[PDB]
Symmetry: C3
Subunit: 123 residues, 3 copies
Amino acid sequence: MSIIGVGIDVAEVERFGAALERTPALAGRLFLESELLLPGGERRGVASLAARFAAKEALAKALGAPAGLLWTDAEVWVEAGGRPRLRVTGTVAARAAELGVASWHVSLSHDAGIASAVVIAEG
Amino acid sequence: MSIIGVGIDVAEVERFGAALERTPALAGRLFLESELLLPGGERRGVASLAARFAAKEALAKALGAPAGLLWTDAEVWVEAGGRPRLRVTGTVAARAAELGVASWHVSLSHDAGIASAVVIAEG
Amino acid sequence: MSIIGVGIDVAEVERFGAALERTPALAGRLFLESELLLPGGERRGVASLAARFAAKEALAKALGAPAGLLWTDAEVWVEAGGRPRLRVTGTVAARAAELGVASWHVSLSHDAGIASAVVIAEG
Ligand SMILES: CC(=O)SCCNC(=O)CCNC(=O)[C@H](O)C(C)(C)COP(=O)(O)OP(=O)(O)OC[C@H]1O[C@@H](n2cnc3c(N)ncnc32)[C@H](O)[C@@H]1OP(=O)(O)O
Ligand SMILES: CC(=O)SCCNC(=O)CCNC(=O)[C@H](O)C(C)(C)COP(=O)(O)OP(=O)(O)OC[C@H]1O[C@@H](n2cnc3c(N)ncnc32)[C@H](O)[C@@H]1OP(=O)(O)O
Ligand SMILES: CC(=O)SCCNC(=O)CCNC(=O)[C@H](O)C(C)(C)COP(=O)(O)OP(=O)(O)OC[C@H]1O[C@@H](n2cnc3c(N)ncnc32)[C@H](O)[C@@H]1OP(=O)(O)O
Ligand SMILES: [Mg+2]
Ligand SMILES: [Mg+2]
Ligand SMILES: [Mg+2]
């Protein structure tokens, strides 16, 4: 395997929350139902959501951000141990296959009113 | 070798310095004596320290942040050329062995009142 | 191939623009003519330029930031699809050869008055 792409993204939490409040349908456009919930069942907060948005932008970047990709075809899930993970389906999986991506790595940080993600695509 | 994990962490310098001043024992809990000094012998400043804290969080993230890890079992050292490096011992080395990590890569930045680190674990 | 280095850099856009305005010769010292233009032909703006500066710092970091490297020996170019790319020549290529670097990966983000880059060197 070799590195096929890297992405980084930094989002302002306040701006992102304002985007969500302005267009009620937006959250469901960007996120699967599972992503909108905490492991317990509570609704996920805006900073954690901004970090997942940053993950999806970073993932897009690592794939060369082509047209035709759906936000709901990338999913951030969470291991029992707490590690965030990427699962790709449909349009995003198809693009990753064009490029030969076998493995995804993500990390998130959110603090200081800002959410950051890095994504590495390997294959 | 393949990538086994990635971590990113962004820390607010002011907040971190306030944490250090509030609990005198904290610095010695987070850092080895060597990390608290500049190559000359002067005491390392708060921004540079916040960046090493971010490195250790990022390293934890790349390992899936399990319980039982000691801050003093990760060490940021510095090459003659100035490159920051990671050395892992004890509990952190043990966890990296569980995952098959052979090689560590780190970079630091601190500026704008914020410290950032990225860590990649390969093996 | 394995990872040979990683770099991250975060630059304040305002500070960087002030540096450019203060010393007219600075832009031409840091950037090739091609980097100072948008694909159309318009002059590239300060935030996008700060992000390319961050890329070159990040690239320097991934190489262990030795003496003797020229800013104009690293070039950020842009694919038809929009992906940013690194090309290295002269002094920067020579240093990458010392270390065995075969492949470069970069991503950029600029938002919230700040520009960020990550660079990975593989070989
Ligand atoms: C995986 C998924 O969920 S995809 C689902 C559908 N969503 C998408 O495809 C969204 C893709 N995102 C976009 O189109 C974005 O506008 C991007 C990636 C082009 C830019 O990201 P933003 O968050 O808007 O801005 P940000 O400042 O973080 O990034 C800009 C940088 O991205 C980089 N970029 C631009 N196009 C691309 C591309 N095709 N591939 C990779 N990087 C790119 C550039 O370096 C740019 O800076 P520059 O113009 O100064 O060189
Ligand atoms: C190497 C050493 O020095 S270890 C020594 C002992 N120290 C440690 O083990 C510290 C480990 N650190 C922690 O427990 C931290 O609270 C962390 C890593 C869980 C989070 O980091 P913080 O700096 O507190 O917050 P930050 O916002 O930067 O990171 C949060 C993100 O980390 C990610 N995260 C949470 N748990 C884990 C995990 N087990 N592994 C990897 N990433 C994780 C999540 O994506 C989370 O955001 P989300 O809840 O919105 O998904
Ligand atoms: C590819 C090219 O275009 S090279 C062309 C010519 N330009 C250069 O060579 C510029 C090289 N840049 C420098 O000298 C910079 O001052 C650097 C890389 C040392 C630091 O970057 P800056 O943007 O000034 O500050 P920033 O806070 O982002 O980075 C500082 C961190 O860089 C790291 N660093 C220092 N020296 C090195 C090195 N030789 N290699 C890698 N990382 C280093 C350290 O972790 C440092 O933080 P610390 O002192 O708290 O440990
Ligand atoms: Mg952004
Ligand atoms: Mg943090
Ligand atoms: Mg900087």
